[model samples]
Structure formats: structure tokens, C-alpha cells
Target: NPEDWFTPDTCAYGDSNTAWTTCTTPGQTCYTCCSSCFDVVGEQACQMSAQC
Candidate 1:
């Protein structure tokens, strides 16, 4: 099974002017944004092998 996790961003705030970005995974796309203290709450996964 695969485990889900969260990684914080180092450059983000709760400002309305903040912009979000997209990251591509094996079969899905993740959205990321900046938090007030340069942090973010999102999902993450790990690939155990080259084909994972």
C-alpha cells in the first residue's frame, strides 16, 4: 500500500495575492499554495521503485 503525507512550503502566506502551483504525480495532480507563515498543508506520496 501507499502512504500519504504532507510537506510544508517554505515560501507562502495567507495573502490573497498568493498564487498556487500544480505538481504531477503518477496518476493525479496536486495543488499547492502559500500559508501565512510560509507553510502549506497538502497530500504527498512516495514511490518505492522506478515503476511506482
Candidate 2:
């Protein structure tokens, strides 16, 4: 199962920083949480699920 990662307030799909729709991207061929999607806040990549 894809892990459940809590999007930080500084990241996409992050808490209340923006609407969920703004970041709720489909997990394409990748096996992580919007790993390819750009960060909603900082330039750092999204904190994808199952990733350290």
C-alpha cells in the first residue's frame, strides 16, 4: 500500500496552506505521494509517502 504521509504545512497537499485540490495529484507511475509534483511552499521536493 502507498504510505500515508502527512503533508507538512510547508509542502503541497499540506495542511490548510492551500486547498487540497491544489495538490491532490494522482500518484502516476511513481510509487510515492506526489513525488514528482513541485513543492507547494519551499523548493524542496514533496515529502512523499514511504520515503525517509
Candidate 3:
């Protein structure tokens, strides 16, 4: 299983959070706590994208 190479679960937070729908522009990228925020009280970009 380990060729000492090919890796998996290498996803870094915010890399592709189904929670955070990247607005492409950046700022338009806000997240809700249900996943991270509450739409109305959603947080701005990179607010809580910490993987660990």
C-alpha cells in the first residue's frame, strides 16, 4: 500500500471545502457555520479554513 510515495487525504483546509463555495473573486467567498457560519453571520475568506 505504501510505495513510500503516492499520498492520499492530502487535502488542506479551504483547498476545496464543499462548505465554502469559492466565489472565484475571493471576498465573495464567505462560509456559514453550519459548515462554518450562518449565511447572515457568515465569515469572510480564510476566516476558519484551518485544517487542523
Q: How many pairs of residues collide in each model? A: 1, 0, 5
Q: In model 2, which residue pairs have backbone atoms overlapping below 3 Å?
A: none
Tell me the tens digit of each residue's lDDT in model 2 across 1-52: 1123334543444442232323344433222434333343322234332232
* Per-residue alpha-carbon lDDT of candidate 3 for residues 1-52, written as tens digits (9 for 90 to 100): 1112112233123333333434222443333222232232234333454221
Q: List the residue pairs that clash in candidate 1.
A: 13-35
The C-alpha stretches of model 3 lying farther than 4 A from their native spots are 1-16, 22-42, 46-52
Candidate 1 structure quality by residue, lDDT tens digits, 1-52: 1111223344332332222232322322223222212222322222222121
Q: What is the C-alpha lDDT of each candidate?
A: 0.25, 0.34, 0.30
Ranking by lDDT: 2, 3, 1
Per-residue lDDT of 10 in model 1? 42
Worst 10 residues of 1 by lDDT: 43-52
Tell me which of candidates 2 and 3 scores higher on lDDT. 2
The lowest-lDDT stretch of 10 consecutive residues in candidate 2 is: 42-51
